[PDB]
Amino acid sequence: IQELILSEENKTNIAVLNLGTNDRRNAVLILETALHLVEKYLGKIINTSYLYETVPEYIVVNYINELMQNLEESKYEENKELIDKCEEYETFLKNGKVDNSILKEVNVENYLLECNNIIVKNDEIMKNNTSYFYNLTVVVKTFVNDPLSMLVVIKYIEELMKRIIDIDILFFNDFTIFMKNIKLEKNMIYKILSKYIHLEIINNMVDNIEFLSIPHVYTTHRYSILLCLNDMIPEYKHNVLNNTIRCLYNKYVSRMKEQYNINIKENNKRIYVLKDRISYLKEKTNIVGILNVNYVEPKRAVQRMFEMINEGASVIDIGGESKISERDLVVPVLQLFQKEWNDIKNKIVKCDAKPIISIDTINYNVFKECVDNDLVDILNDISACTNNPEIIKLLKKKNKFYSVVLMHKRGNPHTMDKLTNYDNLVYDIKNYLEQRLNFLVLNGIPRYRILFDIGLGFAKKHDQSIKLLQNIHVYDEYPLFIGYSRKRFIAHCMNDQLLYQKNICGGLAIASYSYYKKVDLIRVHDVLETKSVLDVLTKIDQVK
């Protein structure tokens, strides 16, 4: 019992996990706490799905903050170093030569029978007599020897966090396992946990581990699982599966339309996260108000910030970059705002009226200072983290994750207008942003915290800027952020302060278009004007 499980030969495995909660209000917090415990106790997070609000598929407070300060250390070291490839993961996808399973495997026929046996039994049990699920999948490059050991460590995580959180193993390497009548005595659980954790309870866990199925029994039966896997590993084909995850996903979607007339997408919603709350993808065009700092007037800038809030902005994007350092332009403004917002002698109940703060910077030192001082929520990196990818390390704090805008450009402001050739503009830009996302996600950044920005006017001719807008549908599956405001291409569409006026007016046309295209965020100079447009369009859509 103690020989191959606690074997000193350290290996690198690939595991796929499903994370789920029922707590709508705290979903982000619950799930992201689990994500941290996974980085800490299991290995490295190298892929995530989007977050989903999910229809239940049963049939065929702040102690979390205090837990985070009392965690036992892992026996395995964290490494935040950027990686550009992962060999084990490539092997896992292909899906070939890894180490032999230390747990006994079953063949396909045995797996299928045992799996169906569990499901029929479960459908029957459950036919007895509510709330949405919040789901996420993750890929972990794990130092844990085997899936039973991993299940033990996962149950500990579940215990530490305690329906609040459900963590399941969907895949572990290419293994096919069905062990039926597991009992591990308490000392064996202790021994497993001690291999991985500097232990400082177990009583619960003995009861809880009844059997082990790899793949998870419900992998092919739950839409919510297939929905999450489709984001991460669509080309993947496990031995016990009739097809790739993408094919299984697509067939499920059509099976609901043809056999049931249900569009299964309608009540299973994709979620992105700007700060700490759920946003439904494509459900709201958010206004991002632009705050340019270039003079020094930190008091005037903070007044403008407050003006913008009242004018209707959900997000404030501050930037010094377009003598005195960038840091000295932005940090004092953010420090003043932070003070002035805290010294609100108004309703302390009115504290969920705070705008999300975004910083338009490519510079590590500036972002590092803002983050340490709790001055910002989002990184707006116009180089899509290519100028200094080390910034990606600052998006992960132990309990906390930050969101990030990835924008496309070529060159710098003086070389930009030259670098205009594209073989296939729309798709070049899209694939570029997709590749940039794969890199952050490979490096442990939650997929649902990443925003795509085509970068209008950045190494684009005016016709190319227009064409990217005509073809904006290309981002229908993704969180989309655009900045068209006061850019020169608008003017090029119209048939000196009159020219500045027509430009602002022309932007509001793009605000309308964005609204109808369900653009998630628009970065604008003119907040009041934009808010007024969106309000009217919203009201015309509201059927009473």
Ligand X SMILES: COc1ncnc(NS(=O)(=O)c2ccc(NCC3=Nc4c(nc(N)[nH]c4=O)NC3)cc2)c1OC
Ligand Y SMILES: Nc1nc2c(c(=O)[nH]1)N=C(CO)CN2
Known binding-site positions for Mg(2+): 158, 166, 168, 526, 529
CA distances from 133 to 19, 23, 50 (A): 10, 8, 14
Q: State the number of binding residues for its own copies (CB under 8 A).
A: 43
Site string for its own copies, 463-482 (x = CB under 8 A): x--xx-xxx-x---------
Does 57 bind ligand Y (CB under 6 A)? Our answer is yes
Nearer to ligand Y, 135 or 530 (CB): 135
Nearer to ligand Y, 54 or 403 (CB): 54
Q: Which does 54 bind (CB under 5 to 8 A by kind): its own copies, Ca ion, ligand Y, none?
A: ligand Y
Does 509 bind its own copies (CB under 8 A)? Our answer is yes
Distance CA 176, CA 217 (A): 11
Q: Which stretch binds ligand Y (CB under 6 A): 29-37, 48-56, 413-421, 487-495?
A: 48-56
Nearer to its own copies, 183 or 539 (CB): 539
Nearer to ligand Y, 222 or 282 (CB): 222
Site string for its own copies, 75-114 (x = CB under 8 A): ----------------------------------------
Nearer to its own copies, 349 or 540 (CB): 540
292 forms bridges with which residues in the sheet? 319
Does 424 bind its own copies (CB under 8 A)? Our answer is yes
CA distances from 292 to 320, 524, 528 (A): 6, 11, 17
Does 254 bind its own copies (CB under 8 A)? Our answer is no
Residue nearest to ligand AMP (CB): 210
Distance CA 461, CA 418 (A): 9
Distance CA 535, CA 391 (A): 37
User: Which residue in the set 213, 358, 464, 465 belongs to the binding site for ligand AMP (CB under 6 A)?
Assistant: 213
Indicate the SS3 state at residue 469: helix
Site string for ligand Y, 14-43 (x = CB under 6 A): ------x-----------------------
Distance CA 543, CA 513 (A): 20
User: Which residue in the set 168, 174, 317, 377 belongs to the binding site for ligand AMP (CB under 6 A)?
Assistant: 168
Q: Token match 């709350």: residue?
A: 277
Does 500 bind its own copies (CB under 8 A)? Our answer is no
Residue 474 DSSP class: G
Alpha-carbon 45 to chain mean position: 12
Site string for Mg ion, 144-173 (x = CB under 5 A): ----------------------x-x-----
User: Which residue in the set 1, 56, 80, 324 belongs to the binding site for ligand Y (CB under 6 A)?
Assistant: 56
Does 151 bind ligand AMP (CB under 6 A)? Our answer is yes
Angle, CA 207 vertex, CA 204 and CA 209 arms, to 5°: 105
For ligand X, the binding residues (CB under 6 A) are 360, 380, 382, 405, 407, 413, 417, 453, 455-458, 481, 483, 487-489, 523
Does 221 bind ligand AMP (CB under 6 A)? Our answer is no
Which H or E run contains 122?
helix 108-126
CB of residue 178 to ligand AMP, shortest distance in Å: 9
Q: How many CA atoms lie within 13 A of 366 on its CB side?
A: 25
CA distances from 272 to 52, 55, 157 (A): 9, 18, 25
HEC per residue, 302-355? HHHHHHHHHHCCCEEEEECCCCCCHHHHHHHHHHHHHHHHHCCCCCCCCCCCCC
Does 208 bind ligand AMP (CB under 6 A)? Our answer is yes
User: Which residue in the set 73, 78, 90, 372 belongs to the binding site for Ca ion (CB under 5 A)?
Assistant: 78
Q: Token match 């919203």: residue?
A: 538
Give just the sign of the alpha carbon dihedral 27, 29, 34, 39.
Answer: positive
HEC per residue, 432-454? HHHHHHHHHHHCCCCHHHEEEEC
Does 283 bind ligand AMP (CB under 6 A)? Our answer is no
Site string for ligand AMP, 106-145 (x = CB under 6 A): ----------------------------------------
Nearer to ligand AMP, 176 or 286 (CB): 176
